TrEMBL record, chains A, B, C, D, E, F:
Subcellular location(s) of the protein: Host cell membrane; Host endosome, Host multivesicular body; Virion membrane; Virion
Organism domain of life: Viruses
Family: Belongs to the primate lentivirus group gag polyprotein family.
Binding partners and assembly: Interacts with host NUP98.
Protein name: Gag polyprotein
Disulfide-linked positions: 198-218
Organism: Human immunodeficiency virus type 1 group M subtype B (isolate NY5)
Purpose of the protein: Encapsulates and protects viral dimeric unspliced genomic RNA (gRNA). Binds these RNAs through its zinc fingers. Acts as a nucleic acid chaperone which is involved in rearangement of nucleic acid secondary structure during gRNA retrotranscription. Also facilitates template switch leading to recombination. As part of the polyprotein, participates in gRNA dimerization, packaging, tRNA incorporation and virion assembly.
Amino acid sequence: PIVQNLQGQMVHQAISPRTLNAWVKVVEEKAFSPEVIPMFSALSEGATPQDLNTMLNTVGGHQAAMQMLKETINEEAAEWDRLHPVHAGPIEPGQMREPRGSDIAGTTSTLQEQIGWMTHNPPIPVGEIYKRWIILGLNKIVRMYSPTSILDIRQGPKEPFRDYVDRFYKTLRAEQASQEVKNWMTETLLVQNANPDCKTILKALGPAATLEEMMTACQGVGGPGHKARVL
Amino acid sequence: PIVQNLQGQMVHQAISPRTLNAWVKVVEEKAFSPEVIPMFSALSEGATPQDLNTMLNTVGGHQAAMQMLKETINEEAAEWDRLHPVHAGPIEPGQMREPRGSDIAGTTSTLQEQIGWMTHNPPIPVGEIYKRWIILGLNKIVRMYSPTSILDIRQGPKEPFRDYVDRFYKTLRAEQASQEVKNWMTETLLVQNANPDCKTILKALGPAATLEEMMTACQGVGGPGHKARVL
Amino acid sequence: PIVQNLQGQMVHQAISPRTLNAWVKVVEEKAFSPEVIPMFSALSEGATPQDLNTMLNTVGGHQAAMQMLKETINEEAAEWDRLHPVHAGPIEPGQMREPRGSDIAGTTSTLQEQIGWMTHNPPIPVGEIYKRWIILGLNKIVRMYSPTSILDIRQGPKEPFRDYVDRFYKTLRAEQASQEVKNWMTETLLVQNANPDCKTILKALGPAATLEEMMTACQGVGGPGHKARVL
Amino acid sequence: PIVQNLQGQMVHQAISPRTLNAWVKVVEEKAFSPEVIPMFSALSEGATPQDLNTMLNTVGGHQAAMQMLKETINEEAAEWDRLHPVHAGPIEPGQMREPRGSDIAGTTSTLQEQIGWMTHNPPIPVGEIYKRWIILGLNKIVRMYSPTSILDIRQGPKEPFRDYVDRFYKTLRAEQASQEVKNWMTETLLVQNANPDCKTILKALGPAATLEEMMTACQGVGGPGHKARVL
Amino acid sequence: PIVQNLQGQMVHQAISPRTLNAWVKVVEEKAFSPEVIPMFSALSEGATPQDLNTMLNTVGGHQAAMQMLKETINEEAAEWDRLHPVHAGPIEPGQMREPRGSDIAGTTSTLQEQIGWMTHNPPIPVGEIYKRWIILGLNKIVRMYSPTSILDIRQGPKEPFRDYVDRFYKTLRAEQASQEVKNWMTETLLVQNANPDCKTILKALGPAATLEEMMTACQGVGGPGHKARVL
Amino acid sequence: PIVQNLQGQMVHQAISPRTLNAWVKVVEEKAFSPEVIPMFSALSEGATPQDLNTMLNTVGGHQAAMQMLKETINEEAAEWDRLHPVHAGPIEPGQMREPRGSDIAGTTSTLQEQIGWMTHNPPIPVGEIYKRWIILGLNKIVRMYSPTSILDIRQGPKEPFRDYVDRFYKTLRAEQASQEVKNWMTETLLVQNANPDCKTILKALGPAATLEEMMTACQGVGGPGHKARVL
């Protein structure tokens, strides 16, 4: 991370080994879930491309997922090179070279250039944009490893509706976003993949219903016990 | 979030993921239990919309509960649009507009605008207005799978009156309904499932008299198990 | 909580979740027990009334006891109203009003105004008035939920005197009796609820021998024990 | 506690719940054994009379020992009353009163009146005196709860000299007598209550020989000696 | 290690005592894995050879490995002094020494020497030289002890492509080969030692497919329990 | 130890219990192992004589070795007396007195006079002299409780070559002998006590010229090298 002087100078403070032990411990427990994506974003506040790459490299699991994350960095670097092409000819004193996607990604540049692109006029924000390409690859990991399909999830004979409904909404989060298919689930896939006793309630409430009535369904119906629950 | 508060100026700082780690672990341990509301309201204090949205995004369970909450937010956002037309700010502090309900949720706003209204005088407090909306949907999530919990909870003579009354007031703690109805549950339902021996005394103490007095009687009844009267 | 000495630095900072969680672990493990009360003063160091409420409401258990605490706050808050003709006459900006019992409970005064009393000249520490009110109530909560009663404490069948004196001072500190009776209790009560094998000795010695002379008599054997921890 | 980081300036920082958690966990485990006495002096270095009490009352166990210290500190408070007058000449702004043994004990004094004496030019040693009365007071516990009769010490029948002298010093550390007496225990009882064959080699070597010569000796008596298993 | 804060001079101070335990936690778990090199690399920023020496001195375990490291360090010290790469020297004769490899390993140079180079103008960065030899020889440790040869690798009998390419890019990750060399392997090797029916499909889709549409290929093909389990 | 070295290197803080517990966990489990020496050194760089005493007298176990350390330090403070004929006051008006071995060892000197020398210009480094003498003792105890035993070890018939050279290289590190005596341990003693199938490789390629060849060579005797305990 960087340390800022009052007049905007940036001395690099290098990332703690203790700071990495704690980070890789969130990944030991949770992999690269929806939980770990905002935690990462926080942990990249003030970061250099080099801080961002040493963070990622310290992980030793998921090395195909970490490569697919890599192909996301590479293509967006390749989108960048055709977006903002480098100048040609000998530069003057007091002029500073524009980065290519390999210098934003900290491969071909020095650290000293990284932190100078941050103190530029106007600044070129290489750490902010490298963190933007990471989250798009961490979401690419998430979309790939979801093992559940929305059509295939269903409610069994002793399964309580709060457990069932929650995990189905938790599945939908890692599907492709789209209002249309989200609306469909509430009319079809939620309704019809119920257990038969809980399905009467869903059909009698049905597709129009207020969400507070809809998500709260089947209390006492089609679970274990007289109250259809483990709680 | 902002730091060093009541100083006439504000400096913003980054939220720690160590703190974000601590957030999710209450939620992962006991879910949106009624104590997790004032805990959020405390960790909310100073927190900008971007932080509030990073804390909500961090939640990985409880996703059907996040749609109950989401339904509060877009419904209060729409209502602010319905009350208010947007207009420019004073030119000398650099206020170019007033926020919308979307600007409040961090959908259509950026950080220096969210801070910018927070630092201005008279103040416009985008995180605090959002806090009052977030805390309100949280309250919805307690009542969600539990309406009338104080009549659902089991009662008899099998545990001591102190054990029952302690689970009683936890169940009144979860309950929203006005204090006159929690006085009537405390006068009627609480006493009815007590022992005949002290039934006359507890009925005068009721909710009216101090709780500590209620512990003076029913001594000698015995711990967990079946009985019908007191020694 | 408020940063350092009160006249000095004059700013407000948010409460960490480490500090909130550390306390919640202890009302859970150790429950309402004599050693809890001063940990609450190490914890509540620099707290406002709003902080003190955020603490008391994050615990998640013991709601009969929290009602006994909240009653205690309510008598003293009501008694402060009865005894004090508290001022409300016409008042100058910058000169601050006289606090009511409910402002001090933190329910009728905004946080700028709570820090405003704590940073006055001379500073008025509203939170410390509310911390002693909690502590005042805790002595009554701690006597009630005590597992040993003074009317029932005896030396065990082969239990050394030195161990039984350790329980009796643990129980006398739970006991909220006056000192004139407590000095009486050592003098009469303790020696009479020793074993008959010690009581021969204790009686011939009489009150002039010191407690360490009597805790040397009726011990277990010399040398180390058979457990791993200290004797 | 007081902290210093710039020469000539004193500043307070609040006692941590985690500092207290560590304290009460090594008192639960090891009680007041010599391994705690310079750990406590290091824990209480900068500590105020307010903070020392905070450590003393956060302990939940070992109450006979704690009570034998409560007797000891107030005996010393009594003695400070004996050899110094009571302060009772009238005071004003810019005039401090001179501490009584109880102001030193923290038992009739507020943090401001304490930190005032302590940050003063030239400072009054109000935190160091109370610390001293606990360090003497722990040495006072340690001597009673010390289990081992050093007079009745003997070598194990298969035990090596190297574990025997190690046990010998470890035991001698908690014994009460002044060091000239410890020195003669070490000469006498270690030569006499070793195993018979050894007792002759120490006589040949000499009772007043150098500790290397004594540590080296007597190997293979009682079967083979042995060494640490880290290669 | 040599650092500055916001003061402007490169100053030596000892590494944190806290860090030392972090570092022992990396050595203890991560030593045979690629995971030690981003950790170590993060540790060794600002490093003098004294600091670099203290890290390899700390490692108490694995001294077959550490001697192979010491032997790599001495072979590279020889090769480096033989080829003499361009770096800063003294401005004029006899001013200070120009280092041998023994001086770069810190064996024949003091810190007093090492500070005087590493702060010079132009600066002589002898730690970094030494650290790069350690980076290479520890990239090799992990290569030597890596349990899984990459050539000899296979896809398991009833194992899917999806979990096979996960341990291929991890097996690849501990390999020492050229970047053009490792790219030739993900397009020859990976596909070649796959199971016949998956191999023949991967042949038709393309060995130079992108990883994200490739990782789901061969799905349910390899036998009835593949079809059942979705592998 | 001294704190805030970039600010001034003059202001102190007492030894931390966290620091002492990491020393007390070393002193139980690793006191006799060569790695004690750099971990101790890293911990106690910047320390006072008072700090250097307090780590050793904090130790509750191994009391003979604490006594062995006390002996070494007096034996060295005795040598300073015969080395230096030092005078009582200042030999030079306007400067400090010279330290004696007792002032160096921390018996005759206050924390103020200790940091008086270190902070005086030019400094006299009374704990850099002290810590050396505890390292002589840590070397002496590494021998005393834990000698090499290099004749006794050998490769058994089902025992691995790599793990046996990992033991020997640890044993050779712990060894304090001259280089030529250790050189024969590598070029003959290793070759003699190895299994005959590992002996051929030892005698062919020279252990004074290669070891990486012989980590890959000789993997029948102790069986296949990826099934080994260390991985």
